[PDB]
């Protein structure tokens, strides 16, 4: 006769993940580059977002 | 080219008011500091009263507290010292100077005074 017994599927073996390029960044260099710093006491305080 | 035109200045009878005017070349006056500084023959430099860069502090001698008045509108690049109720002692050769900058971050207590224009005399005669 005939019968149902197994069960049968492919598996995958690497794995790819995508993102929608690094247009825009955060602009770091003017604290590093910064062409004069800030006192002791106060301070600039800049606001990343 | 830097420079400060001042107008406005001569001849008050005491007691009556007088507005100064001055422009400015080479910069934009909004970024820095300004100084009065009024300069009399066979006497010291006298210091009146500045503006600050942005405006949000203005400080006066104690001679001229609350009765000379210094205004701005930065959108023309005009200074206006008011002069109310001349007294004797006012009678000297008025400059005006600039100063330091946002440009340079630095402390309080500003330092000013690498530039001045040709400034003009009032003269409180009777």
């Known amino acids: 006769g005939i019968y149902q017994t197994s069960n049968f599927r492919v598996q995958p073996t690497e794995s790819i993940v995508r993102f929608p390029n690094i247009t825009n960044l955060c602009p770091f260099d003017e604290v590093f580059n910064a062409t004069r710093f800030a006192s002791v006491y106060a301070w600039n305080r800049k606001r990343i977002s | 080219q830097v420079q400060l035109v001042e107008s406005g200045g001569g001849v008050v009878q005491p007691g009556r008011s007088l507005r100064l005017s001055c422009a400015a070349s080479?910069?934009?006056?909004?970024?820095?500091?300004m100084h009065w500084v009024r300069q009399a023959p066979g006497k010291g430099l006298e210091w009146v009263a500045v503006?600050?860069?942005?405006?949000?502090?203005?400080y006066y001698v104690d001679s001229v507290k609350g009765r000379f008045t210094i205004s701005r509108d930065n959108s023309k690049n005009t200074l206006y010292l008011q002069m109310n109720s001349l007294r004797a002692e006012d009678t000297a050769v008025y400059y005006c100077?600039?100063?330091?900058?946002?440009?340079?971050?630095?402390?309080?207590?500003?330092?000013?005074?690498?530039?001045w224009g040709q400034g003009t005399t009032v003269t409180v005669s009777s």
């Open positions: 100077a600039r100063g330091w900058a946002y440009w340079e971050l630095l402390p309080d207590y500003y330092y000013g005074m690498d530039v």
């Open positions: 080479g910069f934009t006056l909004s970024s820095y500091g």
């Open positions: 503006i600050s860069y942005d405006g949000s502090n203005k």
